[PDB]
Design a protein around this nucleic acid. Structure first.
Ligand SMILES: Nc1nc2c(ncn2[C@@H]2O[C@H](COP(=O)(O)OP(=O)(O)OP(=O)(O)O)[C@@H](O)[C@H]2O)c(=O)[nH]1
Ligand SMILES: [Mg+2]
Lengths: 181, 1068, 326
DNA sequence: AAATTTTATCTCCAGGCGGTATGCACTTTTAACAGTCACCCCCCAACTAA
DNA sequence: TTAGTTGGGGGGTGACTGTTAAAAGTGCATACCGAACAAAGATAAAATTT
């Protein structure tokens, strides 16, 4: 919720502060290089950095940690119960969305076959928000054949996909993902 | 359709990407291990990448070249999991679990040498090298040292793969120089015969001259007591069965079929019910319900197996291999039978757990024997064995049944190993939960389909005992009503609970005997306990020959049922009952705002008790009718002390008068000169009227009332009815019929009698105490000396108690006057019997209260006061009676207490040689199983860390020792009677035999008692106890105290045991 | 250990509280364990009749002597109030008595349940057996047996602090709420009449008075305020569905519902009855996700009566006498 | 050390309470910054079998 | 039922390379609650108590 944004965030870890603070130097060194490589060299010198720098970063992090411990403790007290409901609903929705997103992605990574095409998807594709407006009125059909041609296309798509569906079940058994059947 | 084409090409690209990713880098079984040691990891990498023909065989020698308490619950469960995977042939899962546990540091700690050895053996049985080398890498990284079993597994693998002689010989000198011996390798316990054959082939590829040690003739026992039994010099006339060989083979085939089926079905003996409409409708509904329950059980089992498998694929232990052991149909049928056997009152959850696990192990064992091929070998060996016990067939040289069984060459009997207790309880819990959730039944049974809501058949309710609460599973009441209405005429028994149809398998070792295929235990105990078996195994092999031979002799006795008594008992049972005669009445005949409940509750309680008694009687009578025209045998085994008990519980000869009256010997014998007299004296003894009279007076009284005997034999239920006045009415009727048939025949001397005659011993415990103490005063009292009239202590105690009661009632006590003449030997018998065993006033009071409640004529309001008065007077009367008995009892109790203080349970050895141990210990902590419905609390027996229970160890040492001495006497008597051709079966202290052989049996009894008690039992016991416990060098003071206590034994008295031979009433 | 009263002002105040009814003067007072007999003298001072149910004979003759020339005000019956009507079934020893015989001796005639209160019992609960005495009194009250046969009898007794808090628990206090609280709040109206520390009474042991100052310091460690409570049985306790025949099923339902406290009502109704649990919850006006710890005693009685009033199913309960003693 | 208080009671034929809080040791999870860029999710409609 | 289909246009996570430490999860262990009523008694061990 917007009230969640109102709650303060935890202090950034020591390694990150070093990465953030030392970034503007590295835009001066080589700005065209890929950030991933640059992260490694800052880490490479975080590996070679002296212990005193780590000690001072850790002291600052501890102080900011105590500070944040204080503001968050004060802030979570003054809020209203309706905001409690808002935050709990939003976090539950966020976890559910994360779970769903992973499930859809695992499925799309496992090469699951597509569903059969539809009369309306074909109409939209022929048409090539704005489309939703145009296809709405265009849907009314004065041709019995328009539905019929679609059935033949539906029949053709269904047969190939079912052959893929019976095929796709085989490797999942071979790999070990028997539950997806 | 360009869209279809682009979709197809994208799917093809994604498939190729996934295939490449899987090939280069989901649930997949992990084979290659990850090792902590950097050098070993590099070695594994370079060996894998060395060459396609990588030197796995040479790496084997490279790894084997170096060779420089109680387990936890999780360790035991993992070991059982690995061995069950070995049996089930799901080795990839065992390997995956092993490598996964080898990954994490904490899980690495649990693994021991045995687990790696088992997985190596599994991989060797298939001959694989790569996986065996991987497991060797793991076992070497763990820091363990390979043992004999590892080298045996390697040799078996090399032999199976038909590898050349070089690697084999190399491993040979390595194992030879490391201090190991091939002879020890060929005697390992955990090695199947196929494994030894393959190892032999592999070894003979290198050294063909090597040969196993030759077989030797079995040794014979040489103990003093048992020398004559096994001596080959003398005249022997062993009994032989009357049946021919062909019938005995057919009977064996029938018993094998019954045990393979695992169930036997018998027709009910209840009154038949005409097929009304309601009965047919109920039967149709019940059949439909059974079909639906079967399908639901199948589906639930499949889903549970899938879930448990998925649990293992994450690296966690489960019960998947245990579920895979049996076929699904067998599990479904077992669950359905258990559901059908559930009583209406319900059963405890833990009891259902012990029961469902016990039935699974037996079927697993039978299936293992059936598949492994031992069944055909058993058939052949038993068919050749039966030539000894057939009347027509002959043996070249007669011998004991076990000796012949071993002489032919016994098949090498390999059975399975019991599961640990945690697995046993978890499996039962899972099965019970499956049964509970799977079954469902309609809400309205009588009305077909008014409502479609479905209610569970079984419920889970809590039963509260004092503060404690227990979980109970109770059937739905409508289901119970449906079962009652259907009234099916078929009963089901487990094959173990029904007497064998073929002669029992001889006892050759503590692991083989009794039933042909089903598992049986030589000493009965709770499931977890194993100390008794370990002591039995660690003893010399020739110690238990006497016990095994006695059990086999008792097992091979042919029985039969009495037709007339069975017919009469059916008439009373099916027609309103006769509870006076022990035949329970039908529940239809029943006695039947705060005042009404006080009557309804009593009526319901009486009805419940009558129903339970009728159910038990129904079981016994149905079994008895099913065996009407057949000959059956009853096997035997021992409790942990040595006393023998028949295995089949329902129908044996330890029951009430009905059970002991229905049975009779199958083989007969001419009465001869004294058979009729012995029959008359047995009838008088069964009557109970004359118990303090000499034999002459008993025979005279028998001759006086011959008319009553004849009348009762002719018209039992419609005559003068004299036989119902006896102490044991049903046995008396059978004896009367036997006597009438004998008398009315032409020549009574040639009559063939099938009826056993019982000879029993007076004051047996005090007869052994007086023999141990050699107390002349005690000996004369218990009929150890030649006397003209029987003498017993119990009547004297009763007389003294009555005199005290008379004197007290003179002064005006109400309780003294109320029980004016109800004082009898019966009330004081058990109390004065157990006073020397260590009974307290609490136990005596409870026993006296039980007898007074059982009087049924004593005013029941005064039971408490009467019990107190009687126990006080009895303990006052026994203040100075026994002296030597009490001295021996005190010595035994003090020794047991002092031994039990230092944390060691008491042990001793019987004069025959059977070792005995007391299993009493304190269980401080109790285990639990977290689960769905509830958490079962069980007791972990089989834990030696627990401290001994000093109360139980002192209390039971004096009673238990005397019981071991009695069993030894019975065994010696049976063994020395078998040589003379006698039929001998015993009940603890009562000996049964034919009418004509009673004199010979009495002579043998007296001689064997004298020979047994001629030996110095007490001194040998003291020496053994000193050598076992006192010799331990823990503390000098504790050992000194034990030595001073043990080394002082009571002095013997002045009594020669040879006079027992002339005692007429020693047994009578 | 007995704790008699030996303080004069305390005895006077207790006598005034016991005779706190200006109307209906003659309340026959049944007293337990009179001990020294100071509260007894105070009770006779105010004029009310007394009957002493002395549990020990060592101090009977002193009370008998004090009752001489009292014109029947003081009558001593050697009896123990907590041993009335033993269930053993044998002859009754003199420490115990049959309630019928005692009430015939005292000349008390039975009255209906809806009538007024015949008697009043004044005494103290057992020191270590309060949870036994409460259960026995509850069993006698619900079944209408023993002294409750003759009518509704008040029992005014002193109870300890912890047991008082456990007895007066409410859904507001979830930790102490249990079966005994439910049954004693459904069956009676409990009122707190007086408060008093432990040291006000003089402990009596088997040998005699506990006069050792060492245990007096230990008595401070054992000190707990003793509340005086009043229980008058409720007139509307028995309805058509809850009767002396059905009380066992109600007791078992209450014990089962508290067997697993952290569970909903439906999770227990599924294990107790074959009827539709959701229907019963709807009928008693409760949400499906209702805990057992959130139900007032009236809710429990309404639940039991609602299940019992169902006429659709012939079999509505799984409780049976076979469940008991197993 | 010596007393008081509390507990179980002759053996065998095979026996056991169930739930809720609290602590500790350990391994496994997630959020905290930095920029790049691709994928997934709409937005707003429209059908249909798994 | 519900979720997955196609059109441009819009935006929001996570892919990434990288450390750090608090928060969650896992598995065993001990303790206290229920002291469901239902008379009473004798004796000798087992445990705390001071
Ligand atoms: N410890 C113990 N042993 C028992 C008990 N009942 C029987 N026994 C043993 O079993 C033996 C045989 O008992 P019975 O045959 O009933 O009677 P008995 O002592 O032989 O005496 P009689 O009645 O004269 O034959 C006894 O001597 C005891 O050794 C019992 O309750 N406790
Ligand atoms: Mg006997």
């Amino acid at each position: 919720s917007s009230v969640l944004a109102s709650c303060p965030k935890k202090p950034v870890s020591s390694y990150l502060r070093f990465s953030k603070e030392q970034l503007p130097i590295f835009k001066a060194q080589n700005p065209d290089a890929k950030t991933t490589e640059l992260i490694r060299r800052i880490a490479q010198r975080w590996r070679e950095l002296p212990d005193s720098k780590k000690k001072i970063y850790q002291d600052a992090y501890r102080a900011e940690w105590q500070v944040y411990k204080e503001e968050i403790s004060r802030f979570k007290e003054q809020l209203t119960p309706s905001q409690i409901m808002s935050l709990e609903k939003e976090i539950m929705d966020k976890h559910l969305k994360r779970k769903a997103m992973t499930k859809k992605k695992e499925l799309t990574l496992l090469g699951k076959p597509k569903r059969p095409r539809s009369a309306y998807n074909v109409y939209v594709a022929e048409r090539f928000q704005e489309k939703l407006k145009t296809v709405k009125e265009n849907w009314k059909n004065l041709s019995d054949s328009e539905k019929e041609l679609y059935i033949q296309h539906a029949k053709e798509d269904e047969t190939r996909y079912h052959n893929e569906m019976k095929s796709w079940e085989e490797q999942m058994i071979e790999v070990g993902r028997k539950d997806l059947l | 359709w360009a869209k279809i084409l682009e979709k197809d090409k994208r799917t093809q690209q994604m498939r190729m990407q996934r295939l490449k990713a899987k090939l280069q880098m989901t649930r997949r079984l992990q084979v290659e291990p990850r090792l902590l040691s950097k050098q070993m990891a590099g070695c594994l990498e370079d060996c894998t990448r060395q060459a396609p023909e990588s030197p796995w065989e040479e790496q084997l020698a490279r790894l084997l070249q170096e060779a420089p308490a109680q387990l936890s619950g999780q360790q035991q469960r993992l070991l059982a999991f690995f061995k069950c995977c070995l049996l089930t042939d799901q080795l990839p899962l065992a390997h995956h679990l092993l490598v996964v546990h080898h990954g994490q540091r904490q899980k690495r700690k649990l693994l021991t040498l045995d687990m790696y050895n088992a997985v190596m053996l599994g991989w060797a049985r298939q001959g694989a090298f790569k996986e065996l080398v991987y497991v060797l890498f793991m076992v070497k990284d763990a820091g363990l040292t390979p043992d004999l079993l590892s080298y045996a597994a390697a040799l078996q693998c090399m032999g199976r793969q038909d590898q050349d002689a070089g690697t084999i010989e190399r491993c040979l000198e390595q194992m030879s120089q490391e201090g190991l011996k091939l002879q020890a390798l060929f005697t390992a316990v955990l090695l199947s015969e196929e494994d030894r054959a393959t190892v032999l082939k592999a070894v003979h590829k290198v050294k063909p001259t090597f040969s196993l040690p030759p077989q030797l003739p079995p040794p014979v026992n040489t103990s003093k007591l048992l020398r004559d039994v096994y001596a080959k010099d003398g005249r022997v006339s062993y009994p032989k069965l009357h049946l021919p060989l062909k019938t005995l083979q057919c009977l064996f085939e029938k018993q094998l079929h019954m045990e393979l089926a695992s169930r036997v079905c018998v027709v009910s003996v209840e009154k038949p019910t005409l097929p009304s409409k309601e009965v047919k409708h109920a039967r149709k509904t019940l059949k439909t319900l059974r079909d639906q329950w079967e399908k639901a059980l199948c589906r639930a089992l499949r889903e549970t197996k899938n879930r448990l498998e998925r649990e293992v694929y994450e690296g966690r232990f489960s019960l998947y291999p245990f579920l895979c052991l049996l076929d699904e149909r067998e599990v479904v049928r077992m669950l359905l039978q258990v559901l059908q056997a559930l009583p209406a009152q319900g059963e405890s959850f833990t009891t259902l757990a012990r029961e469902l696990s016990a039935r699974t192990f037996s079927r697993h064992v039978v299936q293992r024997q059936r598949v492994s091929g031992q069944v055909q070998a058993l058939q052949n060996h038993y068919r050749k064995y039966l030539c000894l016990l057939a009347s027509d067939a002959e043996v070249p040289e007669p011998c004991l049944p076990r000796q012949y069984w071993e002489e032919l060459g016994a098949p090498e009997a390999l059975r399975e190993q019991p599961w640990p207790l945690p697995v046993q309880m978890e499996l039962g819990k899972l099965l019970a939960e499956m049964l509970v959730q799977a079954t469902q039944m309609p809400c309205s049974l009588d009305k077909p389909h008014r409502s479609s809501r479905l209610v569970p058949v079984l419920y889970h309710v809590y039963s509260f005992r004092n503060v404690q609460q227990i979980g109970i599973l109770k059937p739905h009441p409508a289901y119970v009503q449906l079962l009652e209405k259907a009234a099916e005429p078929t009963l089901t028994f487990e094959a173990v609970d029904v007497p064998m149809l073929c002669p029992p398998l001889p006892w050759t070792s503590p692991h083989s005997g009794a039933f042909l295929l089903s598992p049986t235990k030589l000493m009965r105990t709770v499931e977890g306990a194993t100390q008794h078996q370990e002591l039995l195994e660690t003893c010399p092999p020739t110690a238990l020959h006497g016990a095994l031979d006695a059990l086999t002799q008792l097992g091979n006795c042919a029985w039969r049922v009495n037709g007339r008594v069975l017919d009469l008992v059916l008439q009373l049972f099916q027609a309103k009952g006769c509870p006076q005669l022990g035949v329970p009445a039908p529940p239809s005949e029943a006695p039947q705002k705060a005042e009404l409940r006080r009557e309804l509750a009593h009526c319901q309680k009486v009805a419940r008790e009558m129903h339970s008694l009728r159910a038990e009687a129904l079981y016994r009578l149905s079994l008895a009718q099913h065996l009407r025209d057949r000959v059956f045998w009853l096997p035997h085994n021992m409790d942990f002390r040595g006393r023998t008990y028949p295995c089949p519980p329902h129908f044996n000869h330890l029951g009430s008068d009905v059970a002991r009256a229905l049975l009779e010997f199958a083989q007969g014998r001419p009465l001869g000169p004294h058979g009729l007299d012995w029959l008359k004296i047995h009838l008088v003894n069964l009557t109970g009227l004359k118990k303090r009279e000499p034999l002459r007076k008993r025979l005279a009284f028998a001759e006086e009332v011959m008319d009553d005997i004849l009348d009762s034999a002719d018209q039992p239920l419609t005559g003068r009815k004299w036989w119902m006045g006896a102490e044991e009415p049903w046995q008396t009727l059978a004896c009367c019929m036997e006597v009438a048939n004998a008398v009315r025949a032409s020549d009574p001397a040639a009559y063939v009698s099938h009826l056993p005659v019982h000879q029993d011993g007076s004051c047996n415990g005090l007869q052994h105490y007086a023999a141990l103490g050699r107390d002349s005063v005690g000996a004369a009292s218990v009929n150890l000396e030649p006397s003209d009239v029987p003498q017993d202590v119990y009547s004297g105690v009763a007389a003294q108690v009555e005199v005290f009661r008379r004197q007290d009632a003179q002064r005006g006590m109400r309780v003294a006057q109320v029980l004016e003449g109800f004082i009898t030997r019966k009330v004081v018998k058990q109390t004065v019997m157990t006073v020397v065993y260590g009974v307290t006033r609490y136990g005596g009071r409870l026993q006296i209260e039980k007898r007074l409640r059982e009087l049924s004529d004593f005013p029941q309001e005064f039971v408490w006061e009467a019990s107190h008065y009687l126990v006080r007077q009895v303990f006052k009367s026994l203040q100075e009676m026994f002296s030597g008995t009490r001295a021996i009892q005190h010595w035994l109790t003090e020794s047991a207490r002092l031994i039990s203080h230092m944390g060691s349970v008491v042990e001793w050895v019987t004069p025959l040689g059977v070792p005995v141990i007391q299993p009493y210990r304190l269980d401080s902590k109790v285990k639990q199983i977290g689960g769905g419905i509830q958490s079962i609390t069980y007791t972990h027996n089989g834990d030696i860390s627990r401290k001994p229970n000093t109360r139980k160890q002192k209390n039971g040492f004096p009673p238990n020792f005397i019981h071991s001495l009695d069993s030894s006497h019975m065994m010696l008597t049976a063994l020395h009677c078998y040589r003379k051709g006698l039929t001998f079966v015993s009940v603890h202290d009562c000996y049964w035999t034919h009418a004509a052989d009673v004199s010979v049996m009495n002579q043998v009894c007296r001689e064997q008692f004298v020979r047994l008690h001629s030996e110095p039992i007490l001194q040998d016991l003291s020496r053994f106890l000193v050598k076992r416990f006192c010799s331990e060098p823990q503390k000098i003071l504790e050992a000194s105290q034990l030595k001073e206590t043990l080394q002082a034994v009571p002095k013997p008295g002045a009594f020669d045991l040879e006079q027992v031979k002339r005692s007429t009433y020693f047994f009578s | 250990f007995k704790r008699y009263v030996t303080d004069r002002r305390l005895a006077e105040t207790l006598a005034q509280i016991y005779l706190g009814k200006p109307s209906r003067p003659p309340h026959l007072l049944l007293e337990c364990n009179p001990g020294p007999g100071i509260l007894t003298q105070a009770l006779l001072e105010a004029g009310a009749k007394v009957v002493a149910l002395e549990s020990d004979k060592t101090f009977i003759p002193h009370l008998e002597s004090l009752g001489k020339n009292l014109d029947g005000k003081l009558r001593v019956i050697h009896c123990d109030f907590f041993k009335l009507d033993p269930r053993s079934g044998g002859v009754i020893k003199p420490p115990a008595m049959s309630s019928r015989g005692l009430f015939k001796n005292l000349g008390i005639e039975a009255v209906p349940w809806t009538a007024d209160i015949p008697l009043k019992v004044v005494g103290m609960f057992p020191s270590r057996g309060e949870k036994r005495a409460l259960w026995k009194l509850a069993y006698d009250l619900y079944s209408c047996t023993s002294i409750y046969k003759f009518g509704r009898i008040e029992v005014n007794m002193f109870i300890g602090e912890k047991e008082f808090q456990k007895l007066m628990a409410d859904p507001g206090n979830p930790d102490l709420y249990h079966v005994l609280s439910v049954i004693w709040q459904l069956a009676c109206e409990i009122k707190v009449l007086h408060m008093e520390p432990w040291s006000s009474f003089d402990i009596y042991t088997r040998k005699g008075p506990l006069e050792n100052p060492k245990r007096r310091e230990l008595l401070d460690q054992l000190q707990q305020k003793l509340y005086l409570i009043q229980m008058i049985p409720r007139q509307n306790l028995f309805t058509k569905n809850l009767t002396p025949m059905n009380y066992n099923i109600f007791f078992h339902l209450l014990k089962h519902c508290f067997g697993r406290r952290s569970a909903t009502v439906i999770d227990h109704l599924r294990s107790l009855t074959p009827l539709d649990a959701r229907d019963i919850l709807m009928q008693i006006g409760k949400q499906e996700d209702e805990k057992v710890v959130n139900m007032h005693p009236q809710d429990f009685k309404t639940l039991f009566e609602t299940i019992e009033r169902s006429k659709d199913c012939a079999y509505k309960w799984l409780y049976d006498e076979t469940l008991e003693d197993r």
